[PDB]
Design a protein around this ligand. Structure first.
Ligand SMILES: OC[C@H]1O[C@H](O[C@@H]2[C@@H](O[C@@H]3[C@@H](O[C@@H]4[C@H](O)[C@H](O)O[C@H](CO)[C@H]4O)O[C@H](CO)[C@@H](O)[C@@H]3O)O[C@H](CO)[C@@H](O)[C@@H]2O)[C@@H](O)[C@@H](O)[C@@H]1O
Ligand SMILES: OC[C@H]1O[C@H](O[C@@H]2[C@@H](O[C@@H]3[C@@H](O[C@@H]4[C@H](O)[C@H](O)O[C@H](CO)[C@H]4O)O[C@H](CO)[C@@H](O)[C@@H]3O)O[C@H](CO)[C@@H](O)[C@@H]2O)[C@@H](O)[C@@H](O)[C@@H]1O
Lengths: 218, 211, 216, 211
């Protein structure tokens, strides 16, 4: 039996991009106009995109025109859907469908569908960090700030509003399994100043316009 | 070209004969197809060219019409036929679908039983509070759940899912989960689930106080 | 002048799939063999894939052959890289690059590169659920099956003894990328002090079985 | 065909003349290119056909060699030249790279100052414990950090990042974060970070007891 299989769905943040792919089994796509259709949470189907044989014609729904691209690879039988600048209303199950019939005519219905792949677009395009203190040898003590679970890059960190710059290391961010970034910023100070000097890290995440001042005491 | 299906939901019994209409905003001759879709499955082509049955489709399905008015008919509704039906105008390099018709089993209106569940202490140790609201055995399917935390209506922090129509009593059930951090959860006292449904004379609120 | 731009990177779990795309500016790709290269955390570059003009030849590194597919779209100037059954060592920055020169020859170097897109592969291909009780205050009780991956999860009550009144809801996908569902049952309130209620959660993708008793 | 660069790290000062060698496991004639790459940027083509300088590339870069032995030479190293350099055998439909040679600023060996930070109580309330280990101002760049939780060597639950070479003193710094659930964190007592580095006579262990 003719089969189609989508690949590439998942969780996307608003404004991001995702590319879907479709492979086939037991036929060649070369003679078929190929299509992308989506089922929205409301339950209805929306035609998304169509690419004719030889890529001669490419057509898009108005809701996705300018943001989506459909492509085909006849030699290896693949169809592609690029989705850029994604909106929450792009959330749907996406199917690749073949235009065809027992005998090919100039206008056939969608006679074969893949099982669909779930694409969900979250409204939150940015997320603000949590800031925790890395609280306090001979004369040198180290203190710092853990800037955790933000998105996207970058985050800027200063110490004492810019007064304290010598000995400051702000490390390259790290990407966690949650899809959120995390970094730390440290500074070494004379240990004899831990009881008289106040230390505040100023964390600025401009993608979300978040400013946080955190005092780091022992 | 705009396609409009009617009705959006059709309630019927096994053995009934039913008709779903599809209207085109302008004449499409007979360039129309009907698809069947079960939840979580792919759409299946039932009828094309307005009235041609695809090979393998039972003879109880029949299509008719042309121009701007089309009809799908099921004669002798069987249990396997309860599902969503989609009409589609298809052209050479584009297509447009109707909004879909859900064919469900008819029964009498039934209000939901409402229950609220505070988060377990075991989950609270993990730093996450899930407050759960259950709407049990209601009909018809449409229901509205609103969360109130110290009477502050919530938005964006809840997710819900609905069961398929029950095999025994033909009702639906709905679960809504409100997710909060342990901190935010412990910053408030009254947690309330408010349910609006046809079978109720007024919205029902079920609540608990943290404690 | 000549520009390339990748798209589609992100976070994938081991065994999953991700498709990258590459667009260009101020030239057409039709006459150029197009390539995918990756920079691994160690700092070195690894050639990944090559697709010749007209897609006549498609070549892959040994580490990715059988799992990756490269495609081209000359009419709209796009290149694609399908990555399936991904491993942790596929973590890298991925650049598309053209072979070219002032005059095109049979063997030119990579004279134009895109800025790269980050692809990260997590080691955990599956994750087992946490099970919490939905304790009763006709009464209702249940189980919250949270933070598993991937689908599906199965739930029974009392190993199959309790089937009447059971509703196991469709899972929901959270913003964390992990699935969560609930399973409830309604019982006579007068049986809460004599009947034991245990939900049996079975997550076959992780071979996990969990029994949780739900007390008032 | 295997390409091997030498050395893997090249330490030098501004104004120096330096040579990076690239050896091919078998003869590749002159099908060899040199690329420059700065962190977070795309590679730039410097030299192709073993010795042809790309238009726009300064004449202080020079490529030479053929067969199995190739050299890149920078005469009058400027600050902008500190970066990674890659050799590449390129054929019609494939390519192979060396492992890269990082050209860094030379200085004397310096052992790191090591510090350990338990998770904040504020974060522990959230259900997550991040333990942080800091290696401050060391040289050269190679360092080894091992986490031990009640002497159990850890793997897979830590991530680290390294700073670029400091503009003032030419040292590097490294941060390693061990991440655990609050439950797992409270299942253990001793948390330790063991640092191995050339500038240390023996590994340094910094530890704390949960409490
Ligand atoms: O999406 C439509 C159709 O596509 C697939 O089938 C292909 C389709 O190709 C069409 C065909 O049109 C012909 C030209 O206009 C020619 O000049 O005249 C004849 C006679 O009227 C037309 O049929 O070819 C052109 C390219 O020349 C192409 O652009 C058209 O889409 O139809 C033919 C059969 O008619 C088929 O062999 C092709 O593979 C397929 O998905 C099908 O189910 C779709 O309906
Ligand atoms: O990847 C190498 C090269 O690719 C791009 O440039 C293309 C390349 O095409 C080559 C050309 O081979 C010649 C023909 O087979 C001819 O029949 O015989 C001569 C005998 O010497 C071959 O050189 O065409 C074939 C397709 O038939 C193709 O497979 C070859 O790779 O080179 C030509 C110029 O030589 C160019 O016009 C093509 O676009 C481009 O990325 C380039 O920078 C790469 O080096």
């Amino acid at each position: 039996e003719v089969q189609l299989v989508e690949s590439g769905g998942g969780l996307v943040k608003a404004g991001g991009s995702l590319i879907l792919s479709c492979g086939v089994s037991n036929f060649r796509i070369s003679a078929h106009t190929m299509n992308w259709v989506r089922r929205v949470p409301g339950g209805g189907l929306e035609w998304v995109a169509s690419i004719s044989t030889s890529s001669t014609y490419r057509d898009y729904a108005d809701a996705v025109k300018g943001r989506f691209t459909v492509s085909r690879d006849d030699l290896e039988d693949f169809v592609y859907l690029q989705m850029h600048k994604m909106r929450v209303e792009d959330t749907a199950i996406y199917y690749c469908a073949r235009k065809g019939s027992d005998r090919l005519s100039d206008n056939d219905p969608f006679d074969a569908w893949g099982p669909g792949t779930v694409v969900t677009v979250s409204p939150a395009s940015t997320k603000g960090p949590s800031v925790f203190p890395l609280a306090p040898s001979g004369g040198t003590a180290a203190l710092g700030c853990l800037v955790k679970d933000y998105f996207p890059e970058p985050v800027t960190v200063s110490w004492n509003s810019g007064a304290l710059t010598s000995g400051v290391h702000t490390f390259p961010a790290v990407l966690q399994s949650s899809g959120l970034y995390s970094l730390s910023s440290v500074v070494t100070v004379p240990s004899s100043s831990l009881g008289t000097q106040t230390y505040i890290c100023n964390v600025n995440h401009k993608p979300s316009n978040t400013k946080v001042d955190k005092k780091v005491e022992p | 070209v705009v396609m409009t299906q009617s009705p959006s939901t059709l309630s019927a019994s096994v053995g009934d004969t039913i008709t779903i209409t599809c209207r085109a905003s302008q004449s499409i001759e007979t360039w129309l197809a009907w698809y069947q879709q079960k939840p979580g499955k792919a759409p299946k082509l039932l009828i094309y060219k307005a009235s041609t049955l695809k090979t393998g489709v039972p003879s109880r399905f029949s299509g008719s019409g042309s121009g701007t008015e089309f009809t799908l008919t099921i004669s002798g509704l069987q249990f396997d036929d309860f599902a969503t039906y989609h009409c589609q105008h298809y052209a050479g390099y584009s297509a447009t679908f109707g909004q879909g018709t859900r064919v469900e089993i008819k029964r009498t209106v039934a209000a939901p039983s409402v229950f609220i569940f505070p988060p377990s202490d075991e989950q609270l140790k993990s730093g996450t509070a899930s407050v759960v609201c259950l709407l049990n055995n209601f009909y018809p399917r449409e229901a509205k759940v609103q969360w109130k935390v110290d009477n502050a209506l919530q938005s964006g922090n809840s997710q819900e899912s609905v069961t398929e129509q029950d095999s025994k009593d033909s009702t639906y059930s709905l679960s809504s989960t409100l997710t909060l951090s342990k901190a935010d959860y412990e910053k408030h006292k009254v947690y309330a689930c408010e349910v609006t449904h046809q079978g109720l004379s007024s919205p029902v609120t079920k609540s608990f106080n943290r404690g």
